[PDB]
Each structure stands twice: as structure tokens, then as C-alpha cells.
């Protein structure tokens, strides 16, 4: 009900796909859950041109990859190729980002713009991601990240209300 899905956005595999309350799918989004399921958290803002593709078929005899996930208050930036990443709640994904195979994003993370998280890259909680090759830039503040996520959730709710159908 509360989830504002855009008209230009596409959600392939509706049974596999999953959208929590107060969600926001921007225009030209692609939540392709044909092969596997895609779980979106509450108050999660998926920005425009975001390719939400399923990680694996989940039909492998041994060591099948985890389909998709997204914690609450997840600020997914525009043009972000989210694939096979278990995003912890309050994860701030950067613009033009790229998630790897079975990448574990921790709580209160801050992915930089134009980043590339590699396969099986376990990011630590309260830490800014940086570099061309994934690495720890520095420890992030708890109060500043929570305030920015609250402001982003309020702004997305206003755009969710009007001008989309």
C-alpha cells in the first residue's frame, strides 16, 4: 500500500519479489526476480536506473548463492547495480555502485559513489567503503548517518505521494 512503485519501473517475478512498507521504487528501475527472490526492507529508497538482479538460480548441487536482500532504511542511490548483496539495515549505497557475489554489507555502512564491492566481501559495521578495489576508508559516525537516513526517508515520502502513476 505505502510502497510507491513507479510506472516506468519494472518488477519481474512478483511472487519472488518483495517490497516492505513505506518503500520507494524510482523510475526506470529493474527488480528482476525471475530466477530468485528479492527482499526489500521497510523505508528503503531504490533510486532511478537501479538494476536489482537476482544473484543465482539457487539450483546448484553444492554452494548455491544467496538470491537477494535489503535491510530497513536502505538508501540505494541512482544507477546502482545491486546484485547478490545482503544489505544490512541503514546501508547507504553510493551512486553508480556495484555489489558482488555473496557480499555481506553490515549495519550502518556507507558505500562510496562509483564503488565496486567484490564477491564474498564482508564489509564491517560503521565503516566507509572506499577505493577502486574494495577497502576500509575510515570509521563513520552513528549520529550523522542516522540523521541523513531520516531526512532521505522524509523526502522520498513526499515524492511517493504525488506525480507517479
Amino acid at each position: 500500500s505505502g510502497n510507491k512503485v513507479s510506472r516506468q519501473s519494472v518488477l519481474c517475478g512478483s511472487q519472488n519479489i518483495v517490497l516492505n512498507g513505506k518503500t520507494i521504487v524510482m523510475n526506470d528501475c529493474i527488480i528482476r526476480g525471475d530466477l530468485a527472490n528479492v527482499r526489500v526492507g521497510r523505508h528503503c529508497v531504490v533510486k532511478s536506473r537501479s538494476v536489482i538482479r537476482p544473484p543465482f538460480k539457487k539450483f546448484s548441487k553444492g554452494v548455491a548463492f544467496f538470491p537477494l536482500h535489503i535491510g530497513d532504511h536502505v538508501f540505494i542511490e541512482e544507477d546502482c547495480v545491486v546484485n547478490a548483496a545482503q544489505i544490512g539495515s541503514y546501508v547507504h549505497v553510493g551512486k553508480n555502485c556495484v555489489i558482488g557475489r555473496r557480499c555481506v554489507l553490515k549495519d550502518c555502512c556507507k558505500i562510496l559513489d562509483n564503488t565496486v564491492l567484490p564477491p564474498e566481501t564482508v564489509v564491517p559495521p560503521f565503516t566507509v567503503f572506499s577505493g577502486c578495489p574494495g577497502l576500509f576508508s575510515g570509521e563513520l559516525p552513528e549520529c550523522t548517518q542516522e540523521l541523513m537516513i531520516d531526512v532521505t526517508k522524509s523526502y522520498y515520502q513526499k515524492f511517493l505521494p504525488l506525480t507517479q502513476v
Binding site: 529493474i30 538460480k57 547495480v81 556495484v98 565496486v116
Partner: protein
């Protein structure tokens, strides 16, 4: 026939795809300039932009039809605007092929990698994602036995995943 062409995917001009080819959703295959040629078992992922270079000038002709090799794993969001490719070449996501190219067999392009215009990539050499033309890391990508076996395993996983996707519909 015998190629998984998606409904959302777009094709234009002459385009002869090989056997067991997989065209993913929202994939552009603009072959208006010249007749496109996709190899057998070549997987084109979603949001991919297959372009061609306008060709046939008498003195120093610019290009010819972009011939993709067999078992070529083109990742999602990959640009391939007029680049000659070899068999068993794994182009990563968000990549960009040059205006003219010669990608040899057993390749492995990195993510967010700008492949060179008028540059022939050597046989058996994995490209680092960021700064172009990185010579390091070309042992595990050997020209065969190591990369041919890995690409055969990658082609099997791609065919198995595409078969599961085709079964789901």
C-alpha cells in the same frame, strides 16, 4: 532458432546469433551500420549496449561487422561498440569496448574497465578493473587448460542458469 531472445530485449538491423545464445532483458542490439555476428553459447546480460561502427570508406576504412566469439560471457551493463572478440572472453559488468579492438581468446575484462580503441588485447590476460591496459594478473587466465577449462565451466553455469530461467519463464 535455438537462442533465448527475451521479449523486453531490442534488436535492430542484421544480426545472426549462434546456437544456445542468451539475450537478457532490456539488452540493446543495434546493428544498423553493419551485420552483427554473435558466437555460439554467447550470453548477453541485461542493460547491454551492442553497437557498431560506420564502415566501408575507400581510404583507411573505419570498421567492419563486430564478430563476437563463442562462449563469450558479456556481463550486465556492458558496452561493446565495434570490438572484435575471441572465444571464451569474460567481459565484466559496466565495461566499455573501444571503437576498434582485437580481444584474444581466454580473456577476462575487469569491472568498470575501458577497453582500448585501436588496441589488440593479447591471448590469455585478465584485465584489472580500474586503470586501462594493466599487464599484471595473466597466469591464472592462461591461454588454455586454465582459462579454457574455466570458460567451459562458466559456459556450463551460464547455460544451466539460462535453462533454469527459461524453465521459470
Amino acid at each position: 532458432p535455438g537462442a533465448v531472445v527475451c521479449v523486453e530485449s531490442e534488436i535492430r538491423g542484421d544480426v545472426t546469433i549462434g546456437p544456445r545464445t542468451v539475450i537478457h532483458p532490456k539488452a540493446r542490439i543495434i546493428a544498423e551500420a553493419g551485420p552483427i555476428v554473435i558466437g555460439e553459447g554467447n550470453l548477453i546480460e541485461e542493460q547491454a549496449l551492442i553497437i557498431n561502427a560506420h564502415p566501408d570508406n575507400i581510404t583507411p576504412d573505419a570498421e567492419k561487422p563486430m564478430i563476437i566469439g563463442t562462449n563469450n560471457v558479456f556481463e550486465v551493463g556492458c558496452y561493446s561498440q565495434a570490438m572484435k572478440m575471441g572465444d571464451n572472453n569474460v567481459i565484466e559488468s559496466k565495461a566499455y569496448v573501444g571503437r576498434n579492438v582485437i580481444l584474444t581468446s581466454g580473456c577476462i575484462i575487469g569491472a568498470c574497465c575501458n577497453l582500448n580503441t585501436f588496441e589488440v588485447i593479447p591471448e590469455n590476460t585478465v584485465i584489472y578493473g580500474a586503470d586501462c591496459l594493466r599487464r599484471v594478473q595473466t597466469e591464472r587466465p592462461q591461454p588454455q587448460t586454465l582459462q579454457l577449462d574455466f570458460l567451459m565451466k562458466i559456459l556450463p553455469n551460464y547455460h544451466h542458469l539460462k535453462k533454469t530461467m527459461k524453465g521459470s519463464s
